């Protein structure tokens, strides 16, 4: 079905997001923000729905996304959390933008009917 194949494409996009060639800016997003290890006493005040690439992977494998647009929304929640929490000139914001640039171009170009 178109949905199952578009989800497969989403896995492939996430796999590229994890690949070495994008690591220099993607890596802050590989895993949940460890608020305790980092001592971020204000993170949970500001970010009500944390998201990261490993969690998105787990949700795809547990079939939690109805379709590619629910996958995309979680990817964009990731980036939004980073834009919301950090100062706009912070290194991690630029890093999020560079990774978002890759994600948006791949996500936009995904076939509308990949099963065909």
């Amino acid at each position: 079905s178109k949905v199952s194949e578009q989800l497969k494409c989403c896995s492939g996009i996430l796999k590229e997001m994890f690949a070495k060639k994008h690591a220099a800016y993607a890596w802050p997003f590989y895993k949940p923000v460890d608020v305790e290890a980092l001592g971020l006493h204000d993170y949970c005040d500001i970010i009500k729905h944390p998201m990261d690439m490993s969690t998105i992977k787990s949700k795809l494998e547990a079939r939690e996304y109805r379709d590619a647009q629910e996958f995309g929304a979680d990817v964009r929640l990731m980036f939004s959390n980073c834009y919301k929490y950090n100062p706009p000139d912070h290194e991690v914001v630029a890093m999020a933008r560079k990774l978002q640039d890759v994600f948006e171009m791949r996500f936009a170009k995904m076939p509308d009917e990949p099963e065909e």
């Binding site: 690591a23 220099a24 890596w27 802050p28 590989y30 923000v33 980092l38 001592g39 971020l40 950090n86 290194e91 991690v92 890093m95």
Partner: peptide, 12 residues
């Protein structure tokens, strides 16, 4: 600090 392999980044 966040860490991944040879990379580090101050978030706090």
């Amino acid at each position: 600090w966040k860490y991944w392999r040879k990379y580090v980044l101050k978030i706090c």
